PDB file of C-alpha atoms and ligand atoms in Angstrom:
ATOM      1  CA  UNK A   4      93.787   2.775  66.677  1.00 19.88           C
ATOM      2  CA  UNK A   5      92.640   0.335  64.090  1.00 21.04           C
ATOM      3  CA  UNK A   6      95.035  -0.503  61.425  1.00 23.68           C
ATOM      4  CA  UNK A   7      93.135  -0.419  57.883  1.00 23.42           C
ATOM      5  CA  UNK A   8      94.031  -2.950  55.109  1.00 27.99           C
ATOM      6  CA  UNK A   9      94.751  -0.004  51.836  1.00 27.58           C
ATOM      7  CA  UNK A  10      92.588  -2.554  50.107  1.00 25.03           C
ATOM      8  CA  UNK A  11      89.616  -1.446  51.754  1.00 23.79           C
ATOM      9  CA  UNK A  12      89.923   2.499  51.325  1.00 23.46           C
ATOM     10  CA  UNK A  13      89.730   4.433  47.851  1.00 23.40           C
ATOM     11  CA  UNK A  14      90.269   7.919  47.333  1.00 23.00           C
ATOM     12  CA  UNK A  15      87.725  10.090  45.453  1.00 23.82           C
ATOM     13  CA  UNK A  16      88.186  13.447  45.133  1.00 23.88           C
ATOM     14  CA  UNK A  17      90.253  16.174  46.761  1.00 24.90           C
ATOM     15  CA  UNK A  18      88.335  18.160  49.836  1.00 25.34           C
ATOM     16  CA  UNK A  19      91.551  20.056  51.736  1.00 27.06           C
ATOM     17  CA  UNK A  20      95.131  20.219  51.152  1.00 27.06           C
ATOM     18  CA  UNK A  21      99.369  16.689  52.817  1.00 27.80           C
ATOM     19  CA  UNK A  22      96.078  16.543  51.327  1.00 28.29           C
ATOM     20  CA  UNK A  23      92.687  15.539  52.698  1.00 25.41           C
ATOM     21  CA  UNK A  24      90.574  13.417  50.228  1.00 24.13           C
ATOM     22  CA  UNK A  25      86.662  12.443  50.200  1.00 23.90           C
ATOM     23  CA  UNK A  26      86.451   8.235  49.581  1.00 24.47           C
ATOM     24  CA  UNK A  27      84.730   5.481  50.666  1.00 23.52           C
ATOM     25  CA  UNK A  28      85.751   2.544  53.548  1.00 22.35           C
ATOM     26  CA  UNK A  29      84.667  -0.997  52.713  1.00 23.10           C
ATOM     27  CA  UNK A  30      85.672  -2.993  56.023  1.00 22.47           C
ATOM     28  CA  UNK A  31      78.524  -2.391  52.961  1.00 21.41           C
ATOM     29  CA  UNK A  32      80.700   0.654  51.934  1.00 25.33           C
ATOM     30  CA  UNK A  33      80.819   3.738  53.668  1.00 27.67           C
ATOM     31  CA  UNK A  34      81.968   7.550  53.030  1.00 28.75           C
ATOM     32  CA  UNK A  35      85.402   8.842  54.868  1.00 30.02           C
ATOM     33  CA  UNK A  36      87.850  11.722  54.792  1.00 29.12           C
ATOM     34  CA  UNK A  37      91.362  10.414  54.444  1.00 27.72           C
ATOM     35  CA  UNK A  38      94.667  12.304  54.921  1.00 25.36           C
ATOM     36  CA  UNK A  39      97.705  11.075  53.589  1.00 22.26           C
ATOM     37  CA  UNK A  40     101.305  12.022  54.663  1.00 25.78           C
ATOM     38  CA  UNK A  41     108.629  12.745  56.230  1.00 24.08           C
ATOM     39  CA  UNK A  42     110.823  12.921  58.987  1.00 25.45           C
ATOM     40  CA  UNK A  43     110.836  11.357  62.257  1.00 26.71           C
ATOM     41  CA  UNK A  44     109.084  14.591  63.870  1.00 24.73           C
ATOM     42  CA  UNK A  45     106.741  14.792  60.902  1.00 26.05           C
ATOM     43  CA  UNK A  46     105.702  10.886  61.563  1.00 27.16           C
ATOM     44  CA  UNK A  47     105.523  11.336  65.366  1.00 27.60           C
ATOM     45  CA  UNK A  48     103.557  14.539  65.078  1.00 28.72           C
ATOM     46  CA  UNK A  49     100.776  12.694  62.417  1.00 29.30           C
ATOM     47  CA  UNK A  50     100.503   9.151  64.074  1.00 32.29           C
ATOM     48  CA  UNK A  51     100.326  11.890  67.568  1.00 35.67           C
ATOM     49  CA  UNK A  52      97.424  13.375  66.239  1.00 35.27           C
ATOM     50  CA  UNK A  53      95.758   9.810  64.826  1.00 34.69           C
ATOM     51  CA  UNK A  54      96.358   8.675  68.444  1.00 34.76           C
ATOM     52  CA  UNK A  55      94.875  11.511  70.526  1.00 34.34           C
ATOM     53  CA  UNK A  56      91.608  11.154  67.914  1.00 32.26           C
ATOM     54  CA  UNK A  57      91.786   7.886  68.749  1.00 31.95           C
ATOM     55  CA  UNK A  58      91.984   8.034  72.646  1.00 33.73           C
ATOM     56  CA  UNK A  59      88.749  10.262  72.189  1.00 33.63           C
ATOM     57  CA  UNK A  60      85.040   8.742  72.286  1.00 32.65           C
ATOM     58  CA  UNK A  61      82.251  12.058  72.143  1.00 37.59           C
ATOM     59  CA  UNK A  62      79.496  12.794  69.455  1.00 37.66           C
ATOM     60  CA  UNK A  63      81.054  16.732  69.094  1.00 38.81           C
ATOM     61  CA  UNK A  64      84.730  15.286  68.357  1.00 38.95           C
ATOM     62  CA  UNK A  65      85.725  13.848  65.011  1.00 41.75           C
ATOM     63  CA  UNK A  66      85.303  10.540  64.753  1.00 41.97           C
ATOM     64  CA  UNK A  67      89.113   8.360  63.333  1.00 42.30           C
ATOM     65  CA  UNK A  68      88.005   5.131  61.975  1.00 48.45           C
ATOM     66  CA  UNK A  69      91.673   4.266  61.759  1.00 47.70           C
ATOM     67  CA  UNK A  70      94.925   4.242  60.303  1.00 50.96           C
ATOM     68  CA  UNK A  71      96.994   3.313  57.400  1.00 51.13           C
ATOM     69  CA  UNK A  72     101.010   3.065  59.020  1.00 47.67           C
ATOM     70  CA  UNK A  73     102.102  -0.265  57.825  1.00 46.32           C
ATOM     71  CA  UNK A  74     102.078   0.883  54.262  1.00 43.72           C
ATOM     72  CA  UNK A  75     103.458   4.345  52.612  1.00 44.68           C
ATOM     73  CA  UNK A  76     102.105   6.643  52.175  1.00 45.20           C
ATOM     74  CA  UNK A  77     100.531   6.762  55.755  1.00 47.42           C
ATOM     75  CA  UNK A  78      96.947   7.476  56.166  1.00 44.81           C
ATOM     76  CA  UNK A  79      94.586   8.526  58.610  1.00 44.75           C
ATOM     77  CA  UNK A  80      90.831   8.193  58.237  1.00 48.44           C
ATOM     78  CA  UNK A  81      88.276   9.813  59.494  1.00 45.52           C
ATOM     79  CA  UNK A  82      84.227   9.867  59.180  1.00 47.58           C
ATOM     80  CA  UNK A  83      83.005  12.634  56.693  1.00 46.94           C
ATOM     81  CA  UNK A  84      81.500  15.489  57.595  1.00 46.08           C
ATOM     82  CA  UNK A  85      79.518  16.635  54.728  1.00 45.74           C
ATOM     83  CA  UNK A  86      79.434  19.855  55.157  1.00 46.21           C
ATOM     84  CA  UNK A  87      82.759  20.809  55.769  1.00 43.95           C
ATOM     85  CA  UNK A  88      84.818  23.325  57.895  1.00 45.47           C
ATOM     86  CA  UNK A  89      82.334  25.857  59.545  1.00 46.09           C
ATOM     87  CA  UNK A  90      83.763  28.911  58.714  1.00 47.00           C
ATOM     88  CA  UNK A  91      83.254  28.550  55.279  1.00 44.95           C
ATOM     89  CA  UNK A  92      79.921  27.102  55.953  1.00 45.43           C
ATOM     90  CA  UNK A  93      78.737  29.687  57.671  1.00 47.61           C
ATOM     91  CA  UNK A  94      79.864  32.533  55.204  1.00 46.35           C
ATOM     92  CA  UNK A  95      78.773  30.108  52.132  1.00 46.02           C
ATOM     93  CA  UNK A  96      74.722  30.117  54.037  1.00 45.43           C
ATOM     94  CA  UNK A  97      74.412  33.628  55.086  1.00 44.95           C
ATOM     95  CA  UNK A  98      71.198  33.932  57.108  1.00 46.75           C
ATOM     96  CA  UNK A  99      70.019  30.806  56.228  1.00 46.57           C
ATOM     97  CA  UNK A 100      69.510  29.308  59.716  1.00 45.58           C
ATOM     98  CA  UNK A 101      67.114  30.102  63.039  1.00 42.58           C
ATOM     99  CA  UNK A 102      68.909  31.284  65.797  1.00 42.81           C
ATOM    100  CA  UNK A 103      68.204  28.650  67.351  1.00 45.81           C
ATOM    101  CA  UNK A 104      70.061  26.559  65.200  1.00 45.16           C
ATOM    102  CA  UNK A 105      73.031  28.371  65.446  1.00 45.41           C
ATOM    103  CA  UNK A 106      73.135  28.308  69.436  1.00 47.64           C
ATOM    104  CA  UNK A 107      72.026  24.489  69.050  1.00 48.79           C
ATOM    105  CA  UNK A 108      75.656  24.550  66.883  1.00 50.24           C
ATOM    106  CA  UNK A 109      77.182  26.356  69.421  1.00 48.68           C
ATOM    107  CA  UNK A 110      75.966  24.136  72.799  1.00 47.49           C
ATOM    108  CA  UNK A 111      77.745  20.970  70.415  1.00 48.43           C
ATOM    109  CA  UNK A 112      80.741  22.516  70.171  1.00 47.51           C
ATOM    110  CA  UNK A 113      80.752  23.276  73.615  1.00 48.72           C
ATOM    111  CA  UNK A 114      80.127  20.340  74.760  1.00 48.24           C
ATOM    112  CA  UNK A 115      83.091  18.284  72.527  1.00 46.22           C
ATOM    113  CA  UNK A 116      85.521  21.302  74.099  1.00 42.72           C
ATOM    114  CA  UNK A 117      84.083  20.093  77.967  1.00 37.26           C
ATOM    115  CA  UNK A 118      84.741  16.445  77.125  1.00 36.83           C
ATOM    116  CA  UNK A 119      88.774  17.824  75.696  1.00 37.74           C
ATOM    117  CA  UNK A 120      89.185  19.895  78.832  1.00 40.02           C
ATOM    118  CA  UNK A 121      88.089  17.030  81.345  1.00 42.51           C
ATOM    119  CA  UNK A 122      90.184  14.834  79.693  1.00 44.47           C
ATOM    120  CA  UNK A 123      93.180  17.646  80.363  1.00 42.82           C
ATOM    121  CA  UNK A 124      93.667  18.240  76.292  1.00 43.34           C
ATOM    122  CA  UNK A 125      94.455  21.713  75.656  1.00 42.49           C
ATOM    123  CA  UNK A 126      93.462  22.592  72.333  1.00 41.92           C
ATOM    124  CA  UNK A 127      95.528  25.860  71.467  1.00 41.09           C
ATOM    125  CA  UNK A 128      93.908  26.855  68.329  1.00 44.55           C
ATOM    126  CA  UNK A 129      89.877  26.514  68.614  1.00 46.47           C
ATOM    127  CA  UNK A 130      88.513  28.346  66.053  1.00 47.91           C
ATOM    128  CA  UNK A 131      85.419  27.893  63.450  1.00 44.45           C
ATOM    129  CA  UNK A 132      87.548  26.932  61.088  1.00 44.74           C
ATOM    130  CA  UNK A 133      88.714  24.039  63.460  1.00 44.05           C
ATOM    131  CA  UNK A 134      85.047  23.124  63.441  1.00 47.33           C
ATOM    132  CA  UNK A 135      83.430  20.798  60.817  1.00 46.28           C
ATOM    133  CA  UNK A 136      79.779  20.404  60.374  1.00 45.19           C
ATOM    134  CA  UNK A 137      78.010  17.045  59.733  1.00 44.35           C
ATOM    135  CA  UNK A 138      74.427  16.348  57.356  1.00 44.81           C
ATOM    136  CA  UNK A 139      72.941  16.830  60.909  1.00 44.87           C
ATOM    137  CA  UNK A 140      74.148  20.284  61.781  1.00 43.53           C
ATOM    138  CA  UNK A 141      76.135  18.643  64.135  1.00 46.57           C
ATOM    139  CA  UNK A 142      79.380  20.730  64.669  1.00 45.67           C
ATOM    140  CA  UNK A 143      82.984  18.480  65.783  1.00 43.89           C
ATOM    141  CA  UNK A 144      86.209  19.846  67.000  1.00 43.87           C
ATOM    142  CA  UNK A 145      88.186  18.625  64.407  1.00 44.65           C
ATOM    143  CA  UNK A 146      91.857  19.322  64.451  1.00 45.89           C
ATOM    144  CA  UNK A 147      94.111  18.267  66.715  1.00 43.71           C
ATOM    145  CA  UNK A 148      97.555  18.835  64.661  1.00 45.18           C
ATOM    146  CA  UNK A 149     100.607  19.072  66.815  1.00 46.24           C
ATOM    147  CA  UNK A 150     102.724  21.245  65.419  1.00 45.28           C
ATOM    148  CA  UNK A 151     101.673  24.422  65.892  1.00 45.18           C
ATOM    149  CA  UNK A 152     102.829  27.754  66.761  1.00 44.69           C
ATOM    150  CA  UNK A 153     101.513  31.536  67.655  1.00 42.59           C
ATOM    151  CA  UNK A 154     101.912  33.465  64.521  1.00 47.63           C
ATOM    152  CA  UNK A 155     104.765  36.093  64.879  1.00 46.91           C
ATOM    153  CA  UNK A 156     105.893  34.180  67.611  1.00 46.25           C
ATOM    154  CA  UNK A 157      99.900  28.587  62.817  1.00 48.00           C
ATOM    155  CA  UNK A 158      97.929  30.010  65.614  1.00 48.44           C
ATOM    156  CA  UNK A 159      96.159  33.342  64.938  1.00 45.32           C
ATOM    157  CA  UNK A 160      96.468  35.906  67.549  1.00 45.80           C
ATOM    158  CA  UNK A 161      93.030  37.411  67.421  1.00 45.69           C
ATOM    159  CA  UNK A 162      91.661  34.161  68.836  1.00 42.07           C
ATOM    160  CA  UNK A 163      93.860  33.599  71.508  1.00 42.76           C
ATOM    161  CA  UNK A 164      93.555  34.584  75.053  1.00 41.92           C
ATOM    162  CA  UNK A 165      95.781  37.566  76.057  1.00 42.01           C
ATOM    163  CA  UNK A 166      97.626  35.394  78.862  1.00 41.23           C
ATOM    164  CA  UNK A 167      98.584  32.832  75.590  1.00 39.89           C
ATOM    165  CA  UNK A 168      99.578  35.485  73.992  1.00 41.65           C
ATOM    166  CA  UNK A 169     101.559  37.619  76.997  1.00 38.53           C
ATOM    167  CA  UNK A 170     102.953  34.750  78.782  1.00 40.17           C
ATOM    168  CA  UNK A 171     102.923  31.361  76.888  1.00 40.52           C
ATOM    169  CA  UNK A 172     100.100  30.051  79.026  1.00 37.76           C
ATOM    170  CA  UNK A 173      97.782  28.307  77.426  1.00 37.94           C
ATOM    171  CA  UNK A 174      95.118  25.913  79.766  1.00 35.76           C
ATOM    172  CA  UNK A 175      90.847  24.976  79.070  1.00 36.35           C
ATOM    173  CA  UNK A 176      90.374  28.385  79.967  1.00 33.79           C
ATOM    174  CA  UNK A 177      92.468  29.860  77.085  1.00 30.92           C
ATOM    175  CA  UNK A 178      90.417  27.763  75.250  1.00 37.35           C
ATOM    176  CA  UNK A 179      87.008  29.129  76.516  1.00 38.77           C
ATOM    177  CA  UNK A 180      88.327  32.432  75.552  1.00 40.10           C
ATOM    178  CA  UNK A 181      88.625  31.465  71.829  1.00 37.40           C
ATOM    179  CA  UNK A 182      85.112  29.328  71.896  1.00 36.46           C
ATOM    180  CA  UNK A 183      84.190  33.191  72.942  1.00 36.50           C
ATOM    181  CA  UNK A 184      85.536  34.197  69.390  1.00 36.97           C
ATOM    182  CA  UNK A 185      83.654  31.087  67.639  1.00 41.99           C
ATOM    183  CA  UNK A 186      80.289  32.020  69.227  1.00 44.17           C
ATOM    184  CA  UNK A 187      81.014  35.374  67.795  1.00 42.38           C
ATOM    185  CA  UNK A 188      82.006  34.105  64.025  1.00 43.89           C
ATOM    186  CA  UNK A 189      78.794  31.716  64.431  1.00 43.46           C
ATOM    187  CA  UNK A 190      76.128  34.565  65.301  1.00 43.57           C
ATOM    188  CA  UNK A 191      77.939  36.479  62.866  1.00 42.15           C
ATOM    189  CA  UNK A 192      77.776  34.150  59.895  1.00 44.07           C
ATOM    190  CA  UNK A 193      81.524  34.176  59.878  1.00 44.17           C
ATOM    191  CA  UNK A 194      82.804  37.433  59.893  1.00 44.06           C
ATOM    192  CA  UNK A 195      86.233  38.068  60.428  1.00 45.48           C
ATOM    193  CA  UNK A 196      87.598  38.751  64.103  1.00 46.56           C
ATOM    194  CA  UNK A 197      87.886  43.073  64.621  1.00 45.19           C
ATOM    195  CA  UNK A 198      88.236  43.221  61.003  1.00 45.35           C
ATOM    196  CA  UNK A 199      91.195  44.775  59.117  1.00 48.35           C
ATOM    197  CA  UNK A 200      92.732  45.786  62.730  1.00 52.37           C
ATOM    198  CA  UNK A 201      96.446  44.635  62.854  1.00 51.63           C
ATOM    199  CA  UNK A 202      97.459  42.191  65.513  1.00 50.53           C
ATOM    200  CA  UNK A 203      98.753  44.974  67.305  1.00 51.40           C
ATOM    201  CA  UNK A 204      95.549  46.977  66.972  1.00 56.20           C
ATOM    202  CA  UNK A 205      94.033  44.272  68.431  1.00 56.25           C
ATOM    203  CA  UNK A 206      95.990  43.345  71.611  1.00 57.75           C
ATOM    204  CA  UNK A 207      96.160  46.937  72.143  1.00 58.69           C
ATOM    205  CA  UNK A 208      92.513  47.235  72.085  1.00 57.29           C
ATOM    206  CA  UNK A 209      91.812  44.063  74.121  1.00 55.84           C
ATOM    207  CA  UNK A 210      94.417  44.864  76.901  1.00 56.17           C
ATOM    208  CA  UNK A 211      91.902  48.696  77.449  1.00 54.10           C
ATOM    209  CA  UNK A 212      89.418  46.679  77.587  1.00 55.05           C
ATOM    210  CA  UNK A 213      87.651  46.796  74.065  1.00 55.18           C
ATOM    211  CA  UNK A 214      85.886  43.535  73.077  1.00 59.93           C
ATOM    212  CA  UNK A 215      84.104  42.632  69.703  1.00 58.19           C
ATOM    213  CA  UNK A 216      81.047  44.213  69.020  1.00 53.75           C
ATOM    214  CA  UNK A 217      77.320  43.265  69.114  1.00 54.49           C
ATOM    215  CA  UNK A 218      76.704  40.635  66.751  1.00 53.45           C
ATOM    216  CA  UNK A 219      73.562  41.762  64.232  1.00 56.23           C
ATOM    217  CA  UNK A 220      70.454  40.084  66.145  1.00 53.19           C
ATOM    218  CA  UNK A 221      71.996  38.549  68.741  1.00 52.24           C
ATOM    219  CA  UNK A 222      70.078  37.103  71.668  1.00 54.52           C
ATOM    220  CA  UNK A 223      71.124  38.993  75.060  1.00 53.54           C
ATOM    221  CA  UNK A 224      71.983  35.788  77.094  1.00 49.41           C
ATOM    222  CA  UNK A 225      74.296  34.828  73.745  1.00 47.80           C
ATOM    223  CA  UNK A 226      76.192  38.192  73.791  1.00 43.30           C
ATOM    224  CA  UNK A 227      76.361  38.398  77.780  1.00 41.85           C
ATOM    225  CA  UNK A 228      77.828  34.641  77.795  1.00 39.75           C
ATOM    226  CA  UNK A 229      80.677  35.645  74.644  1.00 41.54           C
ATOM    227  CA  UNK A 230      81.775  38.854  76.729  1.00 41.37           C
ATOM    228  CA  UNK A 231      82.209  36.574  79.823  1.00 43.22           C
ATOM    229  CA  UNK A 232      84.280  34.139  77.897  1.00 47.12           C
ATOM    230  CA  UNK A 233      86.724  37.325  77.394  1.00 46.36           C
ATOM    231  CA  UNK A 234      86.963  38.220  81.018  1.00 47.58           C
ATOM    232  CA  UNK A 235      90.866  39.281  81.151  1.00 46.86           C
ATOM    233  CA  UNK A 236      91.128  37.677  84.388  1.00 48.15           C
ATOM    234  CA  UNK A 237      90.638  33.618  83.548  1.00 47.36           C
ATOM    235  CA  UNK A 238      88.938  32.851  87.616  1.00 45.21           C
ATOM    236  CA  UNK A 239      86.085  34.973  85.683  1.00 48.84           C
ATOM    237  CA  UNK A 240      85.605  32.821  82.599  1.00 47.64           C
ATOM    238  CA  UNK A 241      82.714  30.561  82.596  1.00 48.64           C
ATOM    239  CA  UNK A 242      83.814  26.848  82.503  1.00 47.07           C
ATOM    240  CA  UNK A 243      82.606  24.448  79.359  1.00 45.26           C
ATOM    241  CA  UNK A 244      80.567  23.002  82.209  1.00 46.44           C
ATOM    242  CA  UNK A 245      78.916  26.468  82.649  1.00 46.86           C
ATOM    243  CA  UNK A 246      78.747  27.021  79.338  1.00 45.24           C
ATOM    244  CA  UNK A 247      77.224  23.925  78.070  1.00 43.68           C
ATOM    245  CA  UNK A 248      74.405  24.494  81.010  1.00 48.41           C
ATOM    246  CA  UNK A 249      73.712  28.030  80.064  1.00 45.60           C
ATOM    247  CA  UNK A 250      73.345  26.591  76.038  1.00 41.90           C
ATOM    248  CA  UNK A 251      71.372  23.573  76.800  1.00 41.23           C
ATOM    249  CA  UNK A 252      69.060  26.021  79.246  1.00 43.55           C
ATOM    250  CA  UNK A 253      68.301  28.867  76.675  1.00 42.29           C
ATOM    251  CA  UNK A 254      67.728  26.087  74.055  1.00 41.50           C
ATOM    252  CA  UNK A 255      64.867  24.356  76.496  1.00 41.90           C
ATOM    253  CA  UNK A 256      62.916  27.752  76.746  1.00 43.70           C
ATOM    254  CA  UNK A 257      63.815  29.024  73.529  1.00 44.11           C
ATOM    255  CA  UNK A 258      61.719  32.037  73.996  1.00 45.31           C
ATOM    256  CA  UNK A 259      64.646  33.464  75.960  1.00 42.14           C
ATOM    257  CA  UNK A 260      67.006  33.650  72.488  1.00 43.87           C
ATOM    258  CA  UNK A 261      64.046  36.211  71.834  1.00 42.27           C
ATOM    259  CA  UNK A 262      65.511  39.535  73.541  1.00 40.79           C
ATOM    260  CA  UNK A 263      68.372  40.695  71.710  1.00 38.33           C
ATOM    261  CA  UNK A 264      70.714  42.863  72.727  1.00 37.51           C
ATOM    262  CA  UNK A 265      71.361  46.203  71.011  1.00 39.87           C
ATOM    263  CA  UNK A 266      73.383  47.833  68.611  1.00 38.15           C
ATOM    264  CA  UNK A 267      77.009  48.142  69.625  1.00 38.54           C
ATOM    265  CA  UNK A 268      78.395  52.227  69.447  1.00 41.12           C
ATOM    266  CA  UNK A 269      80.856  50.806  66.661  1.00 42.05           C
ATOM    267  CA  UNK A 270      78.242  49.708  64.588  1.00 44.58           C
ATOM    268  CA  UNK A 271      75.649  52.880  64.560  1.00 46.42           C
ATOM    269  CA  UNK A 272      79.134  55.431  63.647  1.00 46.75           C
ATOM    270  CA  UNK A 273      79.380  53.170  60.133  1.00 46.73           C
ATOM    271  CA  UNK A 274      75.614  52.945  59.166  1.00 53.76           C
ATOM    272  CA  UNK A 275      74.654  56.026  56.911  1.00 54.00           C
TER     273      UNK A 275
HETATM  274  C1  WT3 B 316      91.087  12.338  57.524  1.00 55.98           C
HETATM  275  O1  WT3 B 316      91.560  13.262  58.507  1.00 55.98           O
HETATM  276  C2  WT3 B 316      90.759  14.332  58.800  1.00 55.98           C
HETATM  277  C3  WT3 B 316      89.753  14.791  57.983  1.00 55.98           C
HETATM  278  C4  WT3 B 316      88.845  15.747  58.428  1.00 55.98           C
HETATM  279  C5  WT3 B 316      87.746  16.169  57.519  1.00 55.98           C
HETATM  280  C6  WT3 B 316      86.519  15.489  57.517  1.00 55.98           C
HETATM  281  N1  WT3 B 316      85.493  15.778  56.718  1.00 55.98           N
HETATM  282  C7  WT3 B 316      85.727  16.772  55.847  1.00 55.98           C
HETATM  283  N2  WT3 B 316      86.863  17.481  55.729  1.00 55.98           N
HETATM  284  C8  WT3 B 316      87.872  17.197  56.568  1.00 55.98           C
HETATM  285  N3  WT3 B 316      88.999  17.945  56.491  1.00 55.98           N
HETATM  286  C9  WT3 B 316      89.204  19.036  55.536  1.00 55.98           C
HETATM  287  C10 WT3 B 316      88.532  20.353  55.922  1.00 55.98           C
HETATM  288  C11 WT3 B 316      88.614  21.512  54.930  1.00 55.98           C
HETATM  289  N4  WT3 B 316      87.909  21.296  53.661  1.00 55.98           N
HETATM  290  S1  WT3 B 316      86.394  21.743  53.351  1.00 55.98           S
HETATM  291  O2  WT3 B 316      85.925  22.478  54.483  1.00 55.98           O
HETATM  292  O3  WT3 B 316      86.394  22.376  52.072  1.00 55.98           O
HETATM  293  C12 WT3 B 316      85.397  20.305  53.195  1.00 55.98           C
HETATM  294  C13 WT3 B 316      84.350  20.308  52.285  1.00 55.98           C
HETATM  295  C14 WT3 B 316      83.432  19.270  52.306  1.00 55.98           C
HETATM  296  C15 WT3 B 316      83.562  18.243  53.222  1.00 55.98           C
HETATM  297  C16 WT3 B 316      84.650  18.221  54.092  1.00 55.98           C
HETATM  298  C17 WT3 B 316      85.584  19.255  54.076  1.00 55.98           C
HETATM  299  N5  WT3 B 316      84.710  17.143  55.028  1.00 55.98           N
HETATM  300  C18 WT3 B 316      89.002  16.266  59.719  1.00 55.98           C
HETATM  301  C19 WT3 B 316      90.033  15.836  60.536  1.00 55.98           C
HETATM  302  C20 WT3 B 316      90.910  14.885  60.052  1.00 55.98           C
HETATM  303  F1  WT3 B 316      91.983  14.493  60.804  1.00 55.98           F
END
């Protein structure tokens, strides 16, 4: 990483919350998100996450300028993404994009979670609100904090793959399981996961093989390509690699995003 001189950041205003600020990097000055800071775990786990950001080089992974660690309180900074995490994005622009643009959103975030899983980084907790979203739609994985944990052991069950769950095992295909759930959030404009179903409810309904419903005008190939992310048996998963294909594909003959699957049985029993 590059160490940063304090001199040259500022802090504007407060964007997440340590805390996560908007402010500007003058190394002719230019906007940055900066998070600020402990024990020894706490400082291993936060200069851990500043150095696997740093050890990564792709347009669909946040991008760390650098770091402040020779001075307290310790810093990391980031570029800005103007528009923020995606799941609030997404339920703050209802219907406000093509579909196109959301499978465009989609193919970018699958390709960032390709580059993780090639370079054997397991993310554990991919989600859309994981995601950030730039000025140019483009989408980031952005989160690679290290401490984290499967709630009722941090990490929400209803986006993890059942072997995660079952047996601890979490690999890239795990992950392609939840990037199943964020295509889902993303056609949906960021509904929530199976609704007000418990966790319980939810595993249950997974493990007899249930999967989430039909998303509202959802393009066939988009819907066929979620449902076999959330193959139970992980051999059946597409890869990133076949995923990013499939995206980039449907994207260059756009016409295909035109036949849309139908309406899910769950979804006719609660329309009057
Ligand atoms: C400096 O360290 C990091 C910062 C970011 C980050 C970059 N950029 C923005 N936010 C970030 N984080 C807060 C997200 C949650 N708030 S938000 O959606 O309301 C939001 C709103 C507007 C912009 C924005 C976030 N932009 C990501 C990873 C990092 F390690």
């Amino acid at each position: 990483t590059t160490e940063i001189h304090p001199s040259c950041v500022t802090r504007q205003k407060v964007i997440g919350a340590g805390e996560v600020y908007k402010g500007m990097l003058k190394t002719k000055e230019v906007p940055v998100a900066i998070k600020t800071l402990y024990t020894e775990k706490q400082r291993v786990d936060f200069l851990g996450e500043a150095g696997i950001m740093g050890q990564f080089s792709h347009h669909n992974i946040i991008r760390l300028e650098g770091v402040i660690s020779k001075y307290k309180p310790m810093m990391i900074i980031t570029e800005y993404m103007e528009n923020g995490a995606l799941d609030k994005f997404l339920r703050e622009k209802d219907g406000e994009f093509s579909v196109l643009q959301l499978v465009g959103m989609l193919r970018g975030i699958a390709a960032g979670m390709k580059y993780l899983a090639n370079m054997n980084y397991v993310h554990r907790d991919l989600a859309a609100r994981n995601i950030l979203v730039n000025s140019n739609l483009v989408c980031k994985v952005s989160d690679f904090g290290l401490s984290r944990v499967l709630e009722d052991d941090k990490i929400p069950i209803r986006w993890t793959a059942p072997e995660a769950i079952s047996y601890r095992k979490f690999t890239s295909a795990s992950d392609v399981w939840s990037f199943g759930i964020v295509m889902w959030e993303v056609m949906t404009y960021g509904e929530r996961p199976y609704w007000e179903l418990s966790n319980h409810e939810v595993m249950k309904a997974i493990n007899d093989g249930f999967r989430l419903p039909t998303p509202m005008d959802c393009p066939s190939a988009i819907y066929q390509l979620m449902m076999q992310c959330w193959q139970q048996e992980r051999a059946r998963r597409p890869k990133f690699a076949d995923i990013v294909s499939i995206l980039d594909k449907l994207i260059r003959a756009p016409d295909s995003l035109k036949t849309l699957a139908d309406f899910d049985p769950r979804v006719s029993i609660r329309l009057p």
